Design a protein around this ligand. Structure first.
Ligand SMILES: [Ca+2]
Ligand SMILES: [Ca+2]
Ligand SMILES: [Ca+2]
Ligand SMILES: [Ca+2]
Length: 146
């Protein structure tokens, strides 16, 4: 159930507005296809009717904000949870920080051999305050939800 602040809904409503081109508050297959053709996609009509249908709670044939949002919050919510759970696997001593030895050790046990250099590269494309570690905040920014 969408608890959400005023900011992520400002994001979700923007997300919606870009789909609802003529602004009548609902997204049609024709409006969905346009967006998707725009982003380089190649869908069929049967495909679009299929997307509009799994989210069309009231079966009227178009997606409205309420319907759009229920679904976007469920997604966003499943994602935050799997990123939260992933953090738990790397941070094996619970300190709230994933260190190189942590990441290295885990990668090894995960079916992957990495060098000292490679690990530092990973724990450095995420590290925003040069301390040699990735905390949950830094981690969540790397794994932008999904
Ligand atoms: Ca519309
Ligand atoms: Ca609907
Ligand atoms: Ca740790
Ligand atoms: Ca850090």
């Amino acid at each position: 159930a969408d608890q959400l602040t005023e900011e992520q809904i400002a994001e979700f409503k923007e997300a919606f507005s870009l789909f609802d081109k003529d602004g009548d508050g609902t997204i049609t297959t024709k409006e969905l296809g346009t967006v998707m053709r725009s982003l380089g996609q190649n869908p069929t009509e049967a495909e679009l009717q299929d997307m509009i249908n799994e989210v069309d709670a009231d079966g009227n044939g178009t997606i409205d904000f309420p319907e759009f949002l229920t679904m976007m919050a469920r997604k966003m919510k499943d994602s935050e949870e799997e990123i939260r759970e992933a953090f738990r696997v790397f941070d094996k001593d619970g300190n709230g920080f994933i260190s190189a030895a942590e990441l290295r050790h885990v990668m090894t046990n995960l079916g992957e051999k990495l060098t000292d250099e490679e690990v530092d590269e990973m724990i450095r494309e995420a590290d925003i305050d040069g301390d040699g570690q990735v905390n949950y905040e830094e981690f969540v920014t790397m794994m932008t939800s999904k």
